[PDB]
Design a protein around this ligand. Structure first.
Ligand SMILES: CCCCCCCCCCCCCCCCCC(=O)OC[C@H](COP(=O)([O-])OCC(O)COP(=O)([O-])OC[C@@H](COC(=O)CCCCCCCCCCCCCCCCC)OC(=O)CCCCCCCCCCCCCCCCC)OC(=O)CCCCCCCCCCCCCCCCC
Ligand SMILES: CCCCCCCCCCCCCCCCCC(=O)OC[C@H](COP(=O)([O-])OCC[N+](C)(C)C)OC(=O)CCCCCCCCCCCCCCCCC
Ligand SMILES: NC(=O)C1=CN([C@@H]2O[C@H](COP(=O)(O)OP(=O)(O)OC[C@H]3O[C@@H](n4cnc5c(N)ncnc54)[C@H](OP(=O)(O)O)[C@@H]3O)[C@@H](O)[C@H]2O)C=CC1
Ligand SMILES: CCCCCCCCCCC[C@H](O)CC(=O)SCCNC(=O)CCNC(=O)[C@H](O)C(C)(C)COP(=O)(O)O
Ligand code: SF4
Ligand code: SF4
Ligand code: SF4
Ligand code: SF4
Ligand code: SF4
Ligand SMILES: [K+]
Ligand SMILES: [Zn+2]
Lengths: 145, 155, 238, 115, 60, 55, 209, 48, 176, 45, 96, 342, 42
């Protein structure tokens, strides 16, 4: 990365959406990496995500208001590289550099999905999916998230 | 009335005790050399009248200034024992108050409180000269509001 | 105030004038110190030949600062290995013969005057420029830049969460500290934290020779020895 | 690998012999510290006190690690004779203030969830 | 005849907590190292870190 | 400053030095405590062209 | 050099001190395993933990080196190494205004020959290492606790030692003395996992294992 | 302030207070957060 | 460039030895010591009257901390947690929460005043100038609990010390 | 606006003395001795 | 705007108030409860809803450099009203 | 239990034990030791101190920050009592005055006050009470101490049916007012023990066992309602102790069989001093009254506390009394004092 | 080649006596050894 900006013009802003009381969508912070639309269409098996517009705008969302009903919808938080998609329950409760991550498994499902439990000062903040490939890869159910 | 007399004798005694302290200074860290800066002419901590060294037995208030490590832990407590009554200690600086910048270190007791009881907590790292001189003035007023003779007559 | 990459804050306007005011009057005060102290027989007698270390014993003992200069060793980090900007300045190193504490007392006093000329040249030749490096990855951006340009916000955010990552290495850099040679041996893991940073406390080597410079003299002179040994408990006890 | 450099002692016989000499020295030094330190303990309990911390580390085989151990005991005895340590330092060894801890599994269970 | 000093009466785990604080957080320790001179210690720590960083300060 | 001429020639003679030339404390020689607004400079990389951080 | 932010390099000192590098190598092949010069223009002489006294005495009296005035000796406690402690000497040449570094490796049960004979400055640096790191130095007049408290048990800068240590002290009234109890903190020292998951400077990349 | 008074704002105290330590009006710290791990509510009934 | 500090030799002529003998037999350098401090006696003192007047300070002064708020009265803190990360003695402990309105600011803000070191990293870390150290320094106490601050006390000081904070930051935001 | 920072006056600054200004004061060694006997001889007379 | 708890103390803006049975209330007895009289929750509402006729507005926060980093909030969600995530000031286009 | 009362931690200062003590009269011989032990596992002490905070200052460094909450109160004010124990798991009472005062008569400190706290604390909603009563106290004793403590003991037990009553026999310690009291004869002439003191036996107990009993009584559920008697493991004829402790102090033992009627007047003559009297007529016969050995009352061993013999736990307090002439000495030296061992 | 009483000792290295760990943190402290799994956010 550089150390200073050459941008002297106005910026661009996008209307925020709401696709479920479990993920927060700040679409202005999106980088149009289209990681969301692919994860939904190929892995989640749903098509509630898409990229509308022509030009710089290129809004990514649902056009018509909808909600992410996927049982694996929680992983799209992990997929988004920016703060465009974030966990609603965790929203502004902790910051990453203070969480003492620990490893455990899912129990809601018999799969025993490997999870990373992020705790801080003696309480559990977030359930993050671990990497195990052949059993759970890097994704966990919405219930255990 | 005897209550009025015990009040006047109370006022007469502590007026000296709030104007004639003698500080046994414990020179430990940057808070300690900062004290001697207060005794410098710019602030004159001797005009109220408390001598900069005051010796062990010729002392009233022990200003605990600096980091208090367990190395010095028994030496200060034995010193506090030798300090005659009425004796008060003013914990100076974040290190002596609660530990400050070395609170989590392995070789420092977290706060001078855990070793001796403190009358005045002056904060700073280091506290500015008057910021501790004000604390001395705070201890000065703390001596004004005591009921020593009054409690004895009440008993 | 001094940070990796420069000084964090700027010089407030009118600050250097007061430096000029104090420096002009400072020399007058130091003569008052000498007038009371230099020729005083009681002080001199209590500080001549009381505590003395030879050239090879001092230099072998890891001594530095005043003691090598007091013993006559022609060494000073500012002149031999001029760091920062000390190359472009004029001064002298007050060394002396004999090696006792009176000359060490004289060494410090002439350092005062030889210091005073440095500030005199420094505020006479203060150049205009930015206070910190123009590298945002090591220097936090200006507050106005933070609230206007994003890369300033991101870099300041990362500079104030983990900070810059120092590449691995192991350097012992020492400078002419006012009391001696202060050095830090810092090994870098390659992350945003130092793996291990060992402090070369000048008094730590100085107090190590307390046996040598307090051999034979009367008991009353030991406090004088630490007085000229110049031991501050802050760094010798680490 | 396998070949090692002895600290001071190669064989266990003379390694334990130095332990014996330390063992000899401290039993000669137990009463005098109690006398000079104006202590509040008897000579006896110090002697088996000395004995028992010979025992907390009596089940180690390596000649080097015990040889660092014996000098460490030497590293404590000279502090005691030279009255370098204070009263608070050698009664710390005579653990007195701390509350006794639960020993049985049930007492540990009753107090807290700390294994 | 004997001049062995008993020191450590001030000792703090300075190097130990330096190991756990970042470089920016490590700076104030040196200001607190020598309780007679403050600022010249920052020169030593700063000069080391910039040397490792291969970054030189501006002439100002 | 305050101090009259009679006290002055006593302190000059006893010290042997002209102390009134410069005092150890300041009457009016300092910068006015508030200062006019400043304008900080710029550095070698506040440009928009050929300042790629890679080189 | 149009770039004023980079540290300006110094090539002449680099090659000259590197030229001194193989000098100390050729005359002492028995002792030196590795000679290193860094981008910061400093030499590190990697030596075996057997000839500390000779190689230091060599640098101390050599007419073309006279590398003396021991700065400091310290370890690193590199844990993932079969010899955790790495005793590191620093010497400051007076006649040639240069600096040298000789580093060894040493396990907790392998004494170091006392360098007090070479640099009787080192009479105090090692005493700190004896307690603060734990590595004992052989054939040495006196190695006591000089930094930690009296009767302290452990080795603080060992990487296994916590910041708060194992004991905490207070004044206890029944015993009328200061007593030490197992350490229990009012506030837990909040650790911070902060290393960037992305690749740092590619220059020092570890090769694929 | 006679020459240059401070900018008037609502949250600024209209009556400055001196240091209060040692008086019945002291400061006493306390947890500002909310209760967590809230105790499971038990029902009553008569019984089974 | 080196300067000797003691290499002068005393001349053995009659005048110099007369100076030396006169110097010690009837003390003069000691009397010169008397004269110097006597001139110091007939000089003004530099001792100020506390708290009737105190030594000068600077707008950059770092002292007792105080959270601030916007001209609307809305708090400045956004619980970005920068100050806690940089706080070198870990005197900052903060907990955030999705505030009911939706601005989602901090729930807890406890400054361990007896752990802080007044380094000033907290104010420069904050991107919204929420946490600043007021110029106050006479805030001593008799209780340890008083020193341990909290969000309420911090907000109260910002309501108390507001003229100074606004003015000092107004004289300094161009500098930093 | 032009750049304005803490800069020295264009003539730099006034000269700052730094050498030792120990004063050369007092009468001659014989002079002290001469008066010393002078007061004494007056004393016994 | 702050209510008094049944015990006799007040409630902080976070919603903190000790229950009567809690023993920690003793810290407050013989003393007072420090609570900021002004509450940021109700101190953001009296600001009039700004009516600016533009698609995107940057909210500096007042004072320019002496404010908060500018955020180009968006004014197109007619049902909602745009708000700066730092200031909370409610920006809406009049009737769009 | 209340949510912020579950015991936590390994028993350190910053570990919440759960007990919420409100020790009364902690500024005394026993109050300092108990409040330390209550502060040693993390119990928020709520002591109403009444004297100058300076005399209560030494109680500060035996607890975590924000644990020892000093509170103002008045002995003759019910509202003062109500505030301090309004929210307390337990309340512990040690209000005791060894001498007789003008403002408080002896029954004021042992009949009114001990019962004046039980009913209001029950009114506030307490769960326990550890009001103590001297074991030697007797209804028909010639000492006002033993009469007053007995009559107050039934009232506090009746008003609070769960009020455990501790019966300390003789709590010896650093300033127990017995060992230093026995040492005090050196300045006051010949030891005025009546009839040479061959007719009275005491059973003393080392203080910190008693405090250990109090905390044990707190955490033991069986304590409610019951009455515990706290005695040491060996008993002595008082002629032994005075000869004993004089020999431990290595001072010249100087007994003198002063007649009983003489000391009766002398005791009140000691009380003539307006300040703290050295000896009271209530203590003149309190010393000469022996101890009872009621077996039905549970003791320290039943409570789970072993009793340290006086011989071992004497050199601590004793060292103050001995001068330089034998200051450097250690334990033993003095003969093991012969016990009559019931 | 390194003759300083180079003598074979085959017992497993056990410095447990000198590290400083107390009698309960040596045994009760079960320690895990894994590689930190990549943070799924990054
Ligand atoms: C012994 C020497 C003779 C007596 C004192 C003479 C004296 O003070 O002369 C003024 C003056 C005082 O010293 P200074 O440094 O010149 O003062 C400068 C200003 O006056 C500095 O301003 P200031 O401080 O003079 O202005 C205010 C001052 C005004 O002070 C005066 O006017 C000084 C006179 C005393 C009042 O009043 C106060 O400060 C109030 C407090 C007064 C303290 C108590 C004074 C007691 C005097 C003696 C009482 C009997 C014993 O000295 C001279 O003028 C020459 C030296 C003394 C010569 C005396 C005759 C031979
Ligand atoms: C108000 C009252 C003010 C005056 C009070 C009395 C005099 C003391 C204060 C003034 C001191 C002046 C010092 C001075 O001039 O120093 C430089 C001068 C010169 O000091 P010098 O050391 O530079 O002299 C160099 C020349 N030789 C080496 C030959 C001496 O000091 C003197 O001349 C001091 C003379 C002291 C004489 C003492 C013996 C006689 C004592 C008689 C009884 C009294
Ligand atoms: N030798 C002994 O002390 C013996 C004591 N006991 C009993 O055991 C307990 C010992 O308690 P301990 O604290 O050691 O005793 P102390 O006499 O040493 O101290 C008594 C404490 O209670 C306070 N107090 C006493 N009477 C009153 C009153 N009327 N009004 C207000 N406060 C009062 C005292 O205040 P202040 O400090 O101002 O005086 C002090 O805090 C008492 O019940 C005692 O009678 C039994 C046998 C022997
Ligand atoms: C305040 C009071 C004083 C201050 C406080 C008390 C101080 C006490 C002194 C310090 C003691 C120290 O901790 C331990 C030490 O010196 S040594 C440890 C055992 N030594 C070994 O070598 C171990 C291996 N064990 C064997 O080799 C043999 O099994 C054995 C020796 C047990 C039997 O003997 P052998 O012969 O069979
Ligand atoms: S995954 Fe996130 S960043 Fe990528 S297109 Fe979707 S919303 Fe934008
Ligand atoms: S943290 Fe990342 S996603 Fe969030 S605002 Fe900053 S750059 Fe955008
Ligand atoms: S509080 Fe700060 S200034 Fe005072 S001793 Fe501690 S570190 Fe030094
Ligand atoms: S000044 Fe105090 S509160 Fe602010 S960052 Fe430094 S230590 Fe933390
Ligand atoms: S005070 Fe500033 S830095 Fe700290 S959490 Fe609030 S906004 Fe962030
Ligand atoms: K995301
Ligand atoms: Zn805004």
């Amino acid at each position: 990365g550089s150390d200073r900006s050459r941008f002297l013009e106005g910026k661009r802003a996008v209307e925020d959406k709401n696709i479920g009381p479990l993920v927060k969508t700040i679409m202005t912070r999106c980088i149009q990496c289209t990681r969301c639309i692919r994860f939904a269409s190929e892995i989640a098996g749903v098509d509630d995500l898409g990229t509308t517009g022509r030009g710089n705008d290129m809004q990514v969302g649902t056009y018509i208001e909808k909600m992410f009903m996927s049982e694996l919808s929680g992983n799209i938080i992990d997929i988004c590289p920016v703060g465009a998609l974030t966990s609603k329950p965790y929203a502004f409760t902790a910051r990453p550099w203070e969480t003492r991550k620990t490893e455990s498994i899912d129990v809601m499902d018999a799969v025993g999905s490997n999870i990373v439990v992020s705790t801080r000062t003696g309480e559990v903040m977030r359930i993050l999916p671990r990497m195990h490939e052949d059993i759970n890869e890097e994704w966990i159910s919405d219930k255990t998230r | 009335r005897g209550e009025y007399v015990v009040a006047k004798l109370d006022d007469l005694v502590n007026w000296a005790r709030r104007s004639s302290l003698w500080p046994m200074t414990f020179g430990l860290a940057c808070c300690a050399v900062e004290m001697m800066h207060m005794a410098a002419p710019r602030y004159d901590m001797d005009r109220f009248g408390v001598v900069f060294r005051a010796s062990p037995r010729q002392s009233d208030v022990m200003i605990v200034a600096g980091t208090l490590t367990n190395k010095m832990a028994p030496a200060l407590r034995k010193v506090y024992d030798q300090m005659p009554e009425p004796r008060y200690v003013v914990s100076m600086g974040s290190c002596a108050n609660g530990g400050g910048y070395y609170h989590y270190s392995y070789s420092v007791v977290r706060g001078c409180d855990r070793i001796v009881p403190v009358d005045i907590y002056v904060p700073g790292c280091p506290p500015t000269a008057e910021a501790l001189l004000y604390g001395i003035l705070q201890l000065q007023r703390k001596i004004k509001r005591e009921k020593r003779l009054r409690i004895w007559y009440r008993r | 105030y001094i940070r990796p990459g420069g000084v964090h804050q700027d010089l407030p306007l009118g600050l250097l004038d007061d430096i000029y005011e104090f420096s002009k009057n400072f020399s007058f005060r130091i003569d008052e110190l000498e007038e009371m102290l230099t020729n005083n027989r009681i002080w001199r007698n209590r500080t001549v030949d009381i505590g003395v270390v030879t050239a090879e014993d001092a230099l072998n003992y890891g001594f530095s600062g005043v003691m090598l200069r007091g013993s006559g060793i022609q060494w000073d980090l500012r002149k031999t290995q001029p760091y920062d900007v000390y190359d472009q300045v004029e001064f002298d190193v007050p060394i002396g013969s004999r090696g006792d504490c009176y000359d060490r007392y004289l060494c410090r006093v002439e350092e005062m005057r030889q210091s005073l000329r440095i500030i005199s040249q420094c505020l006479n030749k203060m150049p205009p420029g930015e206070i910190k490096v123009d590298d945002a990855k090591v220097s936090p951006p200006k507050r106005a830049e933070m609230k206007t340009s994003m890369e300033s916000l991101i870099h300041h955010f990362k500079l104030y969460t983990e900070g810059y990552q120092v590449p691995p290495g192991a350097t012992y850099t020492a400078i002419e500290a006012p009391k001696g040679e202060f050095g830090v041996y810092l090994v870098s893991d390659g992350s945003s934290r130092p793996y291990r940073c060992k402090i070369k406390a000048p008094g730590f080597a100085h107090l190590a020779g307390l046996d040598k410079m307090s051999k034979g003299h009367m008991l009353a002179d030991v406090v004088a020895i630490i007085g000229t040994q110049d031991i501050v408990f802050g760094e010798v006890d680490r | 690998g396998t070949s090692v450099k002895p600290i001071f002692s190669r064989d266990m016989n003379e390694a334990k012999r130095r332990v014996r000499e330390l063992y000899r020295a401290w039993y000669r030094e137990v009463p005098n510290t109690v006398h000079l330190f104006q202590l509040d303990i008897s000579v006896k309990q110090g002697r088996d006190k000395v004995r028992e911390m010979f025992m907390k580390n009596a089940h180690v085989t390596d000649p080097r690690v015990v040889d660092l151990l014996v000098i460490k005991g030497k590293m404590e005895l000279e502090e005691t004779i030279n009255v370098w340590k204070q009263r608070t330092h050698i009664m710390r060894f005579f653990h007195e203030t701390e509350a006794p801890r639960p020993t049985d599994f049930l007492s540990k269970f009753y107090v807290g969830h700390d294994p | 005849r004997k001049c062995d000093p008993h020191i450590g009466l001030l000792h703090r785990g300075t190097e130990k907590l330096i190991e756990y604080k970042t470089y920016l957080q490590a700076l104030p320790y040196f200001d607190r190292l020598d309780y007679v001179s403050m600022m010249c210690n920052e020169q030593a720590y700063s000069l080391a870190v910039e040397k490792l960083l291969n970054i030189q300060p501006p002439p100002r | 400053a305050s101090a009259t001429r009679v006290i002055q020639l006593l302190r000059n003679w006893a010290s042997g030095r002209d102390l009134q030339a410069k005092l150890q404390l300041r009457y009016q020689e300092i910068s006015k405590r508030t200062q006019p607004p400043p304008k900080l400079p710029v550095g070698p990389s506040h440009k928009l062209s050929n300042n790629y951080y890679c080189t | 050099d149009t770039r004023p932010t980079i540290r300006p390099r110094n090539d002449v000192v680099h090659k000259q001190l590197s030229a001194f590098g193989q000098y100390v190598a050729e005359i002492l092949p028995k002792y030196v395993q590795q000679v290193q010069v860094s981008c910061f223009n400093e030499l590190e002489i990697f030596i075996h933990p057997d000839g500390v006294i000779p190689v230091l005495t060599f640098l101390r009296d050599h007419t073309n080196a006279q590398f003396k005035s021991l700065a400091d000796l310290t370890a690193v406690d590199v844990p993932t190494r079969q010899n955790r402690f790495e005793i590191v000497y620093n010497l400051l040449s007076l006649r040639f205004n240069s600096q040298i570094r000789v580093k060894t490796y040493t396990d907790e049960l392998t004494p170091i020959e006392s360098s007090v004979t070479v640099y009787k400055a080192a009479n105090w640096y090692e005493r700190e290492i004896w307690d603060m790191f734990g590595v004992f130095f052989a054939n040495h007049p006196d190695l006591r606790r000089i930094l930690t408290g009296y009767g302290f048990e452990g080795h603080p800068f060992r990487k296994d030692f916590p910041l708060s240590g194992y004991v905490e002290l207070r004044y206890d009234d029944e015993v009328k003395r200061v007593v030490a109890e197992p350490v229990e903190l009012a506030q837990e020292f909040r650790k911070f996992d902060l290393n960037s998951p992305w690749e740092a400077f590619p220059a020092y990349r570890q090769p694929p294992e | 302030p006679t020459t240059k008074p401070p900018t008037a704002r609502k949250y600024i105290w209209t009556n400055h207070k001196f240091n209060v330590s040692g008086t019945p009006q002291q400061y006493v710290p306390y947890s500002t957060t909310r209760k967590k791990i809230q105790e499971w509510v038990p029902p009553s009934t008569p019984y089974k | 460039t080196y300067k000797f500090v003691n290499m002068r030799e005393p001349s053995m002529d009659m005048k110099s030895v007369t100076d030396r003998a006169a110097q010690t037999l009837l003390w003069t350098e000691l009397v010169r010591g008397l004269g110097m401090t006597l001139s110091y006696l007939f000089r003004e003192p530099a001792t100020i009257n506390y708290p009737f007047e105190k030594g000068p300070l600077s707008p950059r002064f770092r002292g007792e901390h105080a959270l601030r708020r916007y001209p609307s009265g809305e708090e400045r803190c956004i619980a970005c947690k920068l100050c806690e990360a940089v706080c070198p003695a870990q005197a900052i402990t903060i907990e955030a929460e999705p505030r009911a309105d939706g601005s989602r600011r901090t729930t807890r803000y406890d400054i361990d005043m007896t752990k802080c070191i007044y380094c000033g990293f907290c104010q420069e870390a904050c991107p919204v100038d929420a946490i600043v150290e007021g110029p106050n320094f006479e805030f001593s106490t008799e209780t340890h609990e008083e020193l341990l601050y909290n969000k309420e006390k911090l907000l109260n000081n910002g309501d108390k010390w507001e003229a100074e904070i606004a003015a000092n930051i107004q004289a300094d935001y161009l500098y930093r | 606006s032009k750049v304005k920072q803490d800069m020295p006056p264009p003539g730099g600054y006034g000269p700052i003395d730094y050498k030792r200004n120990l004063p050369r004061r007092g009468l001659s060694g014989y002079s002290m001795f001469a008066v010393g006997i002078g007061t004494l001889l007056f004393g016994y007379w | 705007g702050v209510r008094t708890s049944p015990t006799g103390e007040k409630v902080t803006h976070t919603g903190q108030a000790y229950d009567d049975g809690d023993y920690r209330r003793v810290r407050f007895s013989d003393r007072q409860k420090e609570v900021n009289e002004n509450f940021a929750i109700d101190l953001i509402a009296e600001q009039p809803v700004s009516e600016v006729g533009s698609r995107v507005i940057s909210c500096d926060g007042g004072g320019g450099a002496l404010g908060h980093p500018r955020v180009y909030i968006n004014l197109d969600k007619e049902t909602k009203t745009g708000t700066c995530g730092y200031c909370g000031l409610q920006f809406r286009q009049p009737h769009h | 239990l209340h949510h912020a009362l579950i015991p936590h931690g390994k028993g350190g200062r910053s570990s919440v034990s759960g007990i919420v003590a409100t020790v009364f009269g902690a500024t005394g011989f026993l109050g300092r030791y108990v409040v330390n032990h209550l502060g040693r596992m993390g119990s928020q002490v709520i002591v109403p101190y009444r004297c100058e905070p300076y005399d209560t200052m030494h109680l500060r460094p035996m607890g975590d920050l924000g644990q020892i909450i000093f509170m103002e109160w008045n002995g003759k004010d019910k509202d003062s009592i109500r505030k301090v124990v309004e929210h307390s798991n337990v309340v512990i009472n040690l209000v005791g005055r060894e001498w007789e005062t003008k403002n408080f008569d002896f029954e004021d400190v042992f009949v009114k006050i001990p019962h004046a706290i039980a009913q209001v604390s029950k009114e506030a909603g307490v769960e326990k009470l550890i009001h103590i009563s001297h074991l030697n106290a007797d209804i028909k004793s010639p000492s006002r101490y033993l009469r007053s403590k007995a009559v107050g003991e039934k009232e506090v037990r009746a008003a609070f049916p769960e009020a455990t009553i501790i019966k300390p026999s003789d709590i010896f310690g650093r300033e127990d007012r017995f060992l230093n009291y026995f040492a005090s004869m050196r300045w006051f002439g010949g030891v005025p023990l009546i009839s040479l003191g061959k007719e009275t036996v005491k059973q003393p107990v080392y203080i910190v066992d008693v405090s250990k009993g109090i905390i044990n009584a707190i955490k033991d559920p069986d304590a409610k309602g019951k009455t515990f008697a706290f005695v040491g493991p060996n008993r002595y004829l008082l002629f032994d102790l005075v000869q004993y402790i004089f020999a431990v102090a290595y001072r010249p033992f100087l007994p003198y069989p002063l007649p009983h009627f003489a000391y009766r007047w002398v005791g009140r003559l000691f009380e003539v001093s307006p300040f703290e009297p050295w000896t009271t007529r209530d203590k003149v016969e309190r010393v000469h009254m022996s101890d009872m050995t009621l077996p039905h009352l549970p003791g320290l061993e039943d409570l789970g506390i072993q009793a340290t013999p006086l011989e071992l736990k004497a050199i601590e307090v004793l060292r103050r009394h001995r001068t330089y002439r034998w200051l450097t000495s250690e334990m033993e030296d003095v003969k093991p004092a012969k016990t009559v061992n019931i | 080649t390194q003759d300083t009483q180079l003598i074979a000792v085959d017992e497993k290295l056990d410095i447990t006596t000198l590290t400083g760990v107390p009698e309960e943190h040596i045994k009760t402290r079960k320690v895990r050894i894994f590689v930190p799994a990549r943070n799924n956010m990054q």
